[PDB]
RNA sequence: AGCGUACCAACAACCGCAUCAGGUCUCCAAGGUUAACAGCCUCUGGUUAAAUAGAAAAAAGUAGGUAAGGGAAGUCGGCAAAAUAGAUCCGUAACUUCGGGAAAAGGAUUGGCUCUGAGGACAUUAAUGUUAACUCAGAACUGAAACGGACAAGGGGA
RNA sequence: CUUUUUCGUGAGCUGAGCUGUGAGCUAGGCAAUAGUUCUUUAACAACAAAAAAGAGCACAAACUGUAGACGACUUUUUUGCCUCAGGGUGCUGUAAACAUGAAAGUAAACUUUUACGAUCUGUUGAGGCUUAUCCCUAGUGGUAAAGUGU
């Protein structure tokens, strides 16, 4: 049924291997597969600013961390909305319901 | 397999040139919590080679030793060793007189306890391990008495004794010609590429030789390697189990930060002198020599001055944790 | 036709990449053809049509004939070195499929005296 | 009066057997750095397309980057690659058809910041007042001793 | 097949003797026939239908990386494992901001006040980073789908 978490991902664990001109791609892809993963969904929408955020710093380097919010919505009955959460500091944050 | 470090030593070879010389050298630390012996087997000589009359078993048995029988042990119904332990003893007692009056080779049935260490594997590993010392009926007698009991490691070797070490070397997988049998590289202006082998073989003798270096598989091979001596066996029930005369400061063999890549060592281990073959966390297997050895370097005993333990992240600075806190004095 | 099992390719096998999948089998070689499935499919639907109009019950119909042609090949060209052009033709073909409802001396006297006595005999 | 006037001009409209990395005549031409219409970055205008995509990442190949100590011992042969290079100030041999050789060979300097000095035009009278452009020469201070910091750019001699 | 019948050997009885089995002694009555031979259908081992009875695993998935071109191999699936975080051990070299703090010098009001200044100092062994194949923690959240062969 629906539910909201939060979580946080760091990307330098996933784009480790990845040359130069395939870094930010790979970041993107690697997120829509794990919320898909962790939600039980094969379709998982990317709200547009998370994409503008994790391209910010150009095709080179993409953010060490990101903080999102994944959503299941009742609509191949079901799917995942992706957003983006702006902090000042990853320090304390763990994972919720 | 755990890691290396090294230690610090007096000599004691009069004549070289290192006659009253403390030195360096480097040693290999294995993790040897206890085996548990489980069961018995023996052979009888026949023309055709060594054959078996009987296996026998203990009366209990472990849930680690029981894995080793399943591919996947979460979704079974764990039924095996559950019947043919209700054996009558008489049963037994019978098949073991047969063994004795007709074999003439013994060996035990032992397996490794994983939970100990800090392995993701929980599957015990078994091996037989064969018992040389008097008669038929003292050799039976001498292993009864342990079906069901551990084997420490300091009950099978000895200080200062020379061991033989089996293993299985680390993987590289495809390798060239050049770094599979260290081949010369030839000239730089070759067209087709200069990492090879030029010539084949002659004409006629019209096919390629098997003495003939190729590509191939690189790694993972099966060694023997013989005459490594033990410097100390360590045991668990003792805070300073790497501390000396010469150097008081209470410690344990783990450097500050664990074993790169392996984790702490908190059971008994063995420290071995040089290299062995493997990477971390590799099993070893540990065999006296065939024959006893008489050398001026078999029977010398050993007296070390200082053990290392120092960090093997980056480069290391301290020898205890406490160290550091007292060097910098209060932080922010 | 969504990769979690695969075609043993036991026939046109040169050269054909070894899979996990191909254990199901007992066979190495597998591989995911897509687009024969999907036309195979359509060929699949058109016989449950047809064997619903006349009334047969779809649970008991067993692929009794499943066969495969090739059909006249297409043209087209390839260019080559040194101003040459070779062909680049194409590999179509026909298929038919039937489905079909399952269920679940010479007395010789001489020779009858013959057998008489050697069954006596026996006795 | 009569005839031409659409469109391409290569990036797939032309020739090369093709929707081929080839060939094919003329005019217009911004900002910063700079000797420079060079190289590198940008505004107006144009595009984000190429007979394919995803994953994996070992041998071997092709186009590159580094390497302790030695410095051509390699090879027919220094083949290939390194080393040099802008500008200012000094200093330059044999020989010579007296014009050269010559950038011969060689040596020193170069950032940033705060200042000092030199070079014109015009109007009330030597005195007062207004008013510019760009170069050149010195001094103090400053930094992990670095500064033609990227680009661009001779190896020399008998 | 009847008659008088002795010696040995076991399903049950207890090296009493009945049964069952074998070998004999004594006197009897009662068979075989298919026109001259056509392999003398004769062995051993199976199978099927009817008649009395003994009644679990592996592959695939997700995870691992001691493995690796692909297959293959090493592991885990609820005291485990994955993810984040807190600690440890290391790498670099002192963050952003504020300061009637310093600074070769400058210029401009009426002792002092104001303005411009490369760079330096204090808060500051600070700030950032650290497994993707580093170490510890039943710390936080999760742990899905149920197919194939036998
Ligand atoms: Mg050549
Ligand atoms: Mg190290
Ligand atoms: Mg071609
Ligand atoms: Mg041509
Ligand atoms: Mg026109
Ligand atoms: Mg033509
Ligand atoms: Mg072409
Ligand atoms: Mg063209
Ligand atoms: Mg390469
Ligand atoms: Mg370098
Ligand atoms: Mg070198
Ligand atoms: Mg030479
Ligand atoms: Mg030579
Ligand atoms: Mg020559
Ligand atoms: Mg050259
Ligand atoms: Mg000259
Ligand atoms: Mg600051
Ligand atoms: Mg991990």
């Known amino acids: 049924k629906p539910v909201t978490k939060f979580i946080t991902i760091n990307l330098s664990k996933l784009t480790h291997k990845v040359c130069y001109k395939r870094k930010a791609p790979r970041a993107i892809k690697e997120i829509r597969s794990i919320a898909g993963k962790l939600m039980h969904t094969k379709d998982v929408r990317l709200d547009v600013k998370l994409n503008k955020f994790i391209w910010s710093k150009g095709v080179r380097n993409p953010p060490k961390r990101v903080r999102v919010k994944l959503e299941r919505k009742r609509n191949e009955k079901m799917y995942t909305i992706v957003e983006h959460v702006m902090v000042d500091s990853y320090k304390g944050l763990v994972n919720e319901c | ?332 | 036709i969504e990769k979690k099992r695969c075609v043993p390719f036991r026939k046109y096998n040169g050269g054909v990449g070894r899979t996990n999948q191909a254990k199901e089998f007992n066979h190495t070689q597998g591989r995911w053809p897509a687009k024969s499935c999907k036309f195979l499919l359509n060929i699949l639907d058109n016989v449950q049509a047809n064997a619903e109009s006349r009334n047969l019950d779809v649970s008991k119909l067993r692929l009794i004939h499943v066969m495969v042609n090739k059909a006249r090949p297409g043209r087209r060209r390839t260019y080559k070195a040194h101003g040459r052009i070779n062909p680049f033709m194409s590999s179509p073909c026909h298929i038919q499929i039937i489905a079909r409802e399952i269920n679940k001396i010479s007395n010789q006297n001489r020779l009858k005296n013959k057998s008489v006595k050697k069954q006596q005999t026996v006795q």
């Open chain 2, 1 to 332: 397999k755990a890691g290396m470090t090294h230690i610090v030593r007096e000599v004691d070879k009069p004549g070289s040139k290192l006659h009253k010389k403390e030195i360096v050298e480097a040693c290999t630390i294995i993790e040897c919590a206890p085996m548990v012996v489980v069961g018995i087997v023996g052979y009888r000589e026949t023309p055709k080679g060594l054959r078996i009359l009987s296996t026998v078993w203990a009366n209990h048995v472990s849930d680690e030793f029981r894995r080793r029988y399943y591919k996947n042990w979460y979704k079974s119904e764990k039924k095996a060793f559950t019947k043919s332990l209700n054996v009558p003893e008489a049963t037994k007692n019978c098949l073991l007189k047969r063994i004795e009056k007709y074999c003439t080779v013994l060996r035990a049935i032992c397996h490794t306890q994983p939970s100990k260490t800090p392995l993701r594997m929980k599957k015990a590993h078994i091996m037989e391990v064969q018992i040389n010392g008097g008669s038929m009926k003292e050799k039976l007698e001498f292993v009864k008495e342990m079906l069901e009991k551990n084997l420490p490691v300091s009950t099978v070797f000895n200080p200062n004794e020379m061991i033989d070490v089996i293993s299985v070397t680390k993987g590289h997988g495809t390798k060239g010609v050049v770094s599979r049998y260290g081949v010369k590289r030839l000239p730089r202006k070759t067209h087709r590429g200069l990492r090879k082998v030029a010539c084949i073989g002659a004409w006629h003798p019209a096919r390629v030789q098997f003495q003939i270096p190729r590509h191939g598989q690189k790694g993972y091979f099966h060694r023997t390697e013989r005459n490594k001596k033990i410097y100390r066996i360590g045991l668990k029930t003792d805070k300073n189990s790497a501390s000396t005369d010469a150097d008081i400061t209470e410690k344990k063999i783990t450097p500050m930060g664990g074993f790169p890549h392996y984790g702490v060592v908190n059971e008994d281990f063995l420290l071995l002198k040089g290299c062995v073959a493997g990477t971390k966390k590799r099993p070893i297997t540990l065999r006296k020599n065939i024959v006893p050895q008489v050398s001026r370097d078999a029977l010398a005993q050993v007296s070390l001055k200082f053990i290392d333990t120092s960090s093997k992240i980056g480069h290391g600075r301290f020898q205890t944790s406490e160290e550091k806190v007292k060097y910098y004095g209060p932080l922010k």
